[PDB]
Structures are given as C-alpha cells and as structure tokens.
Design a protein around this ligand. Structure first.
Ligand SMILES: [Ca+2]
Length: 251
C-alpha cells in the first residue's frame, strides 16, 4: 500500500524549518540551533540541525505532518545522529509526544510517550534510550541497546509491531528485538496479554530535549512511517553519498 509518512524532516528546504520547529520559552538560556552540513559532507547543500553552545539545555519541538494511530499497523521511527565534535557528555535522543502538546513550553518535565536515541557521558555510559509508555508512566527498557560514540553518522531506528513486538536498529545492524512485555517492565512479570501495549494513538510531536556539554551534534533524516521497507530505503538513499566519504575517514 502506499506508505504513511507521519513526519519527514531533512532540513533541506532553506529557512523553512524555522516555521515548523518551535524553540521552547520555558527557560531563558536554552541552547541555540543552526543548520550545518558538517565537517565531512558530500553536498555542501545537505544540512542538518546543529547544537551551537556548550553547557546548555536544548528544547526544540515540532508537530507531525499527520497524527499517528498505529492500531494494526507497524510504527517506524528513524533518524540520524552525528557527534562530529567528539562528544564527551550529551544527549542525542528525541522525545515523541501527544499531538496537543504546548511546544512553546516543551521541557524535561513535559509529558512524553517515547524517549529514544543515544546518550553518551564518558566511555561507560553508551546507551540507546528506548523508553516507552504504558498506563500513565514511562518505562526504561531492561537492557538498553549500545550507542555509537565515534564522530560519524549513525541511523537509529525503532520499530513497534501490532503483535506487541519491536526491533531496534543502529544502521543496518539489528541490536535488539523481542516482545514488549518481556524486554521492559511495563507489565506484571508473569506472562500475560496486554493487547494494546504497542499502541501510540494520538502521537503527533517530536522534540529535542537535551543537555550537552561539548556541543556540535548534527541531527538529520527524521522519518516516522508505517512502512519498515520505505524506512530502510529512505535512509539508504539519504546517506548514499555520505557513507563512503565517512568510511574513507574512518580507515
Ligand atoms: Ca538534510
């Protein structure tokens, strides 16, 4: 069928991102954002979203193109993180919220449904957050996927299936998968059905709610869809030029 595109953000239509994304006014000293093609690039016209200030909180959010109801469909969330600055301590994860969230006040205390993406602070903490929602509370995964700490582009992807199962991908490596009821503690420990555990009806906003010490991270290629194959295709095409450029540098 034809893939539903709940959100597609590639920051490539000039200044237009400034009318989609809202800078929260909850704090007066929020970190400041900018478009950039990065140190290593293929096209001096391929831009990502960049943190510009050290030792700051960030809070910038935006509505979906279309509100989500993943009842009886997959839900695919994917985007790219580039810690080109060689990050010491900082978040690189996104927050997914209900559609009627007040973006002008978005912050750490705002309710959210999913928190997903890398979090680095020293060489021990290298975790991919994977926080889901059930019955009024957020729940951390039991064993988080391991995050990338190098200076190159990494695609982080979360897939939720209507049989209450999930996958987590970093690039084309599937780091985690299984059942929602087992790999989290959203449910009572003994086995039993929670039929709509997978369901995120009304999901409609994405936000970067972050702290960074050494800033300079670039986010790009944000897709929220119901089509896992379109998501692999979309990322593969978006990074088609960049991947070899970075591979040359790693070797
Ligand atoms: Ca882009």
């Amino acid at each position: 069928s034809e893939p539903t595109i709940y959100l597609k953000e590639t920051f490539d239509d000039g200044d237009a991102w400034k009318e989609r994304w809202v800078q929260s006014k909850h704090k007066d000293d929020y970190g400041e954002w900018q478009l950039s093609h990065g140190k290593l690039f293929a096209d001096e016209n391929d831009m990502g979203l960049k943190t510009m200030q050290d030792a700051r909180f960030y809070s910038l959010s935006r509505k979906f193109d279309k509100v989500v109801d993943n009842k009886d469909k997959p839900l695919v969330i994917v985007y790219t993180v580039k810690h080109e600055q060689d990050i010491d301590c900082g978040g690189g994860y996104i927050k997914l919220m209900l559609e009627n969230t007040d973006l002008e006040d978005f912050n750490s205390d705002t309710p959210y449904r999913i928190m997903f993406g890398p979090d680095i602070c020293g060489p021990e903490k290298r975790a991919v957050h994977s926080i889901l929602w059930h019955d009024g509370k957020n729940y951390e995964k039991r064993k988080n996927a391991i995050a990338m700490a190098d200076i190159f582009t990494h695609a982080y992807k979360l897939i939720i299936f209507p049989n209450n199962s999930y996958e987590i991908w970093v690039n084309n490596d599937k780091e985690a998968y299984g059942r929602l009821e087992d790999d989290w503690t959203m449910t009572e420990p003994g086995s039993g059905p929670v039929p709509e555990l997978y369901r995120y009806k009304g999901l409609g906003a994405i936000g970067f709610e972050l702290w960074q010490v050494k800033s300079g991270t670039i986010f790009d290629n944000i897709l929220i869809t119901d089509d896992p194959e379109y998501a692999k295709e979309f990322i593969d095409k978006q990074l088609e030029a960049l991947r070899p450029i970075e591979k040359v540098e790693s070797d």
